[PDB]
Write an enzyme that holds these catalytic residues in place. Structure first.
Site, short mmCIF file in Angstrom:
data_model
loop_
_atom_site.label_atom_id
_atom_site.label_comp_id
_atom_site.label_asym_id
_atom_site.label_seq_id
_atom_site.Cartn_x
_atom_site.Cartn_y
_atom_site.Cartn_z
N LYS A 186 -57.46 99.18 19.85
CA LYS A 186 -57.83 100.14 18.78
C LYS A 186 -59.35 100.28 18.71
O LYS A 186 -60.06 99.38 18.26
CB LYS A 186 -57.26 99.72 17.41
N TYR B 204 -59.00 94.93 18.14
CA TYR B 204 -59.50 95.90 17.13
C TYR B 204 -61.03 95.79 17.02
O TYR B 204 -61.59 94.77 16.60
CB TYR B 204 -58.76 95.72 15.80
#
Ligand code: NA
Lengths: 295, 295, 297, 296
Positions: free
Chosen positions: C167, C139
């Site tokens: 992500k 992330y």
């Protein structure tokens, strides 16, 4: 290069209502600086509005300053442009007019590699034909983010005599003073003059010196004797002014105060700098009257 | 305005061995672009190395380009300088030579207020005398960070016919397209062109279009027809080249490709741009020989 | 990355409901999870930025993870955001996610203190271990994290053994294409909802976002529309998402979302935890009107 | 509230938190450090801040550190509890605990990660001040790590909140240091970057707080003296010496650099920081060991 050590006003460039060079007012401001007891002038820098003048205009300003002031004080010519070739022209012109030194801002707008930066200075150093170079580091406007190592390489290039360090990073100032014990190391940010000296600057170049350059020499004196109260008291009064100048716009505020001192005739900067908001005229006038009394 | 919609090459400025204007190679480059089926040329922009040229040299390029393409493709004159007065001089010349529009980058180096930015554009529009203005927003190089509101005001000023949006913020792209449904909106980063169009740009101004501008026309066609895979495939090939150009230096990489295409005699940029590293020559020759196969 | 191929799609970054005493509201958490499912969401990303991870304890994050799993396991895909500044803490939550039978784990690049790329890389290896077989989703959100990774650094991160997805909460769509080009099969979540159509076009094959809690079907719609080469519907749907996002940015995104879910009879108490303040009362009409709008749709 | 907190004016170490080979708290090495600090003539301890690795500890762990420090140091030196978390409620818990243990002041970093409005930042401080139950608040500003960029005006509102008595100013902007002194002549103003202490003091800081004070806090005390005396020269020599050491500490990594130094001064048994911080590079041990000896 220690002969270049001191407090040097970043000279403003007067214009008129047509935006033309006001050479009468340039001569007067140059003499005004000599009589305040300035150590020297830094000509056509940021404060001189370099980047809204042609090479020809910048040359005319250098020529007039050298006429008015050569052999009276030290003279550094800011010859920097984004172009190397243009910066060379200005360097050659500086030498012709009998300046004591050249200076160039790190070329901006386009990203250049550090090697390109170094070659840029070498090239200007050549064209200045013996004049020492003052490397000018102003990260906040140039966008050029030099490392300490990269600064070390530039300040040791053949022909470099000084650094104009317009950085608020006083850790870096010390690191420079520490690595280069002899270096003429100008503090660039007026609002921290006293503190930059302590970190290791041995003089300054600044815009506000045009209206109160004595207060900054007052600070250099104050510290030398170890009178720290007088140093701080003086920086505070300097910073009271710098607050004002920041509200009004710094160059045009400075030029407005010089209008009220009958030294500059038309206190305009060039477009797209606008005029000083009339709401401030009262404080500027009053600041002008205040300073005349003090001198 | 709407006749300014399209894929426009940010024209490079070829220089000879002494770094003067190579008129020959300029002219060939103009024709090289015209052949490739490009919709127009954007002259004396960042890509044309405007900020390392004199006003006279910029005027001279605008003249040579207009001599060879006026009537054949669209011609936009980037007249922007830090100084408003200088910008107005180039605009007035763009008018005389018969350009279809003029453009100005937000003025850089010195901090200017938003209202000063506005006046700057108004003043240049005046001097342009009927040519519509293309606002040029490039925050990564100008340091000028416009809010959406400030952009809205700028693009609705009388005489503004388009915005060249050299920003990677595709929320802001969409927001501008939503607020101004009829605005010519050029995507400015070549490497996100497909997504820029998807977000709401309806054309683009770019430097790599000089060597592969049919690819950018191909991405347009494919989106227009629903060939999303084809769009993405083309953007990928574009980016494979941009990867290389970023490693070599984009302007000088481009010129060097173009030298191997028999278009540019001497593929040099102006100092302080250095020369292309010799290690990249095998890759760049391959790339031009590959692009010559293609169209 | 073929191992995590099944992680592909559109997942809501699940909001964590709270009551007026700032305690977890577990009944509204269950309601919100069932709402996302009855909506048609592909999956939920639990305890991330949108879920107010960084103003909760590990115990609270664990409590929220358990309940979501209870409500949703085997029905939609479940991704546990376990990231903390501390690796040990991130590992605790990793192990917990696994105890609850999550389909994946995820961790933000650790923030506040500067860490080296090598210090980062290990951090993820240590969490992938504790995940005990769950794929990892790196992330990346440089605007909040202050971590500025080069493309090369990211390439290494996203090819660590165990990593099945990225992500990418970055608006740099050059970089999005570069990551896709390098990784033909990598599961690549678009993170900024306001550029979703653009992100997919650049290389994304799905996304994780906060606004999917109220309008997830629109993002599925953009996905479908791009797959069948319908640009005009994707643009229209992105514009519709962006009009709502404009509003949410004025109100506060998390609390605006919670407020819309409150007018939709989902969230009992639309508060974020302090130091987030309440929604400005002047925005309540717009927010109520949008809730009705979206329920109608 | 500025007049009330003038007793907090001074030089004060930002205490490191020792950890054992299992990454758990090394309580033994922690107690020694409070002593090793106290014997330097330090005016105080800022406990559980950035350098105390606050943000990779749990609340219980932070409370345990504050407790074990208060045991040792209460009465002897000034005790500032850095209670700041991203969460207001968590910050309030630590504030309450700091007051139970009898600390002199609390402190909180501007809450980070999530963008909060200036009104939100103000409410955050008010809430922690309420929980502090009469303990003065030290607002802690560190824009480089927190990402929170307050204007001068916002800082002025912040530092005049009821209950605020001081500002820890980890900023290299010495114009703003001067300006703040000028707006607030009686505010306790702690210089936050050690590498400009001398310069910070000249600009208006009437003291400071720092991480390198752990291994050489007597050097920083020397500077305060020289400036009151009006002896500029020695103030520079000392500041130059601090920056010679800061230079190396940045090379190795500052907290673990310092902890490795203390491991060589036999103060700290396992010189680790918590993951994801890694060990010091092996090549650097010769200089760190050498520096430990030089300082002893
Ligand atoms: Na040729």
């Amino acid at each position: 290069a220690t002969n270049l050590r001191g407090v040097m006003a970043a000279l403003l460039t007067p214009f008129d209502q047509q935006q033309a060079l006001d050479k009468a007012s340039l001569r007067r401001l140059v003499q005004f600086n000599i009589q305040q007891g300035i150590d020297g002038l830094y000509v056509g820098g940021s404060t001189g509005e370099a980047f809204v003048q042609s090479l020809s205009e910048r040359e005319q300003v250098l020529e007039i300053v050298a006429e008015e002031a050569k052999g009276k004080i030290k003279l550094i010519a800011h010859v920097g442009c984004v172009s190397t070739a243009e910066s060379q022209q200005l360097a050659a012109s500086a030498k012709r007019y009998g300046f004591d030194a050249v200076s160039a801002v790190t070329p901006f707008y386009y990203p250049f590699s550090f090697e390109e930066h170094c070659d840029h200075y070498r090239a200007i150093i050549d064209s200045a034909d013996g004049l020492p170079m003052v490397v000018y580091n102003i990260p906040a406007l140039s966008g050029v983010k030099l490392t300490l190592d990269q600064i070390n390489t530039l300040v040791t290039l053949p022909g470099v005599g000084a650094l104009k360090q317009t950085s608020g990073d006083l850790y870096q100032m010390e690191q420079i003073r520490r690595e280069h014990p002899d270096l003429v190391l100008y503090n660039g940010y007026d609002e921290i003059f006293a503190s930059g000296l302590l970190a290791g600057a041995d003089g300054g170049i600044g815009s506000t010196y045009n209206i109160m350059g004595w207060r900054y020499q007052g600070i250099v004196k104050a510290l030398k004797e170890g009178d720290i109260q007088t140093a701080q008291k003086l920086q505070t009064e300097c910073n009271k002014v710098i607050d004002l100048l920041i509200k009004t716009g710094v160059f045009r505020g400075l030029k407005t105060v010089l209008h009220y001192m009958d030294v500059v005739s038309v206190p305009l900067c060039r477009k797209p700098f606008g005029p000083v908001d009339e709401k401030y005229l009262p404080e500027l006038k009053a600041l002008a009257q205040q300073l005349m009394q003090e001198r």
